[PDB]
């Protein structure tokens with residue numbers, strides 16, 4: 271039942287969940303009662319089980335359910351028993367770029383946004399590797415400012431990652447990949463919502479920069495260090511005896 | 513004469529002063545002069561303050577006698 | 581995360597004290613003069629100091645233990661250089677040792693539950709079989725590429741050799757004279 275609920279709640283990755291666990295139960299039951307249905311490794315035995323249980327209740331969905339040789343076999347058997355940017359004009363899918371975005375373990379909402387961007391504005395293109403590259407980079411720089419604000423060892427590792435995920439030794443093209451999308455995507459309300467959420471504004475806060483730029487000297491350029499820093503740095507030399 | 517404690521606190525977060533500190537941590541396994549001077553006794557601190565405050569900043573006089 | 585736990589552990593090393601005297605700190609300082617590369621521990625001493633490691637070392641110990649080993653080695657590495665700066669290259673992992681007296685449970689009352697957890701007990705000894713050896717660090721050369729590599733193993737005295745670096749499968753000889761090993765034995769109880 272644990273494994274049943276596991277594989278059944280593996281579909282997302284009201285009446286649905288209930289009726290589907292009941293379905294898989296009595297389905298597996300019917301399939302194992304008689305002596306007719308054998309040599310079926312339990313390795314895989316809760317999948318077109320789940321697909322036909324989708325087919326049964328009320329509404330069914332061909333996509334995102336089967337997601338192979340024996341998949342067809344067992345189906346019939348049960349059903350009877352009952353570089354990257356020089357490349358010109360490439361093509362992509364939903365899950366291709368879900369992969370290239372989920373490699374950073376970023377959320378799926380940002381990915382859906384880049385997907386919407388694409389399927390509306392993937393029309394007039396030369397190469398979508400550039401656009402989606404720049405997109406997910408300017409997702410990373412905006413959401414990952416904290417860890418980077420304290421760890422400048424990150425910005426080399428990250429750019430190195432996407433330099434070789436798309437197979438180049440030259441990188442200034444990637445720099446352009448970022449600034450051009452930033453020129454493009456600059457002013458949409460959803461981009462706006464993300465900037466108020468994760469608070470980069472060029473990577474710097476609002477309540478600081480406005481005094482940086484309106485015309486002030488109270489502007490806190492933190493050359494000096496904060497108090498808790500020293501409060502914890504002192505422990506390193508406390509035990510200096512050893 | 514008016515060298516207050518809060519001033520003494522904030523000047524401690526001179527990060528270059530931390531560079532100097534740790535440079536001497538690794539120059540000397542013992543830790544006697546640093547406890548002699550540091551904020552754990554602020555007397556030596558303010559003493560060092562005036563001591564390194566008085567200096568010439570010889571860069572500027574260097575530019576001067578260079579012009580000369 | 582794991583480094584939070586590492587620090588919660590390493591503070592117990594030098595920031596623990598009872599009867600107004602450091603215990604494990606100078607224990608290590610002695611053990612290293614002994615050239616021992618291990619220690620002794622009580623786990624009773626960790627319950628009051630901190631509860632962020634106990635309830636998880638209980639049920640996922642092997643997940644937590646080599647961490648402590650590495651923390652120990654980290655403490656060693658500073659103190660080695662500091663004591664060289666004080667007076668007067670190859671520092672492996674230190675076997676940890678510990679004990680307890682919380683309880684004793686017998687072989688009879690076991691079951692197939694609380695398996696891979698940690699248990700306390702009594703009994704009587706028989707075996708003194710033989711000093712059977714294992715490896716810890718062993719060098720490898722390919723027979724065709726002449727392509728040197730290296731391997732080290734940690735706890736389980738999981739993986740095997742590499743299946744491919746044409747040389748074909750099994751391209752590797754194990755060199756001994758620049759390899760390293762350790763001992764164990766097979767000990768009984770009743």
Ligand SMILES: [Zn+2]
Pocket residue numbers: 722723724725726727744745747751
């Ligand atoms: Zn080879």
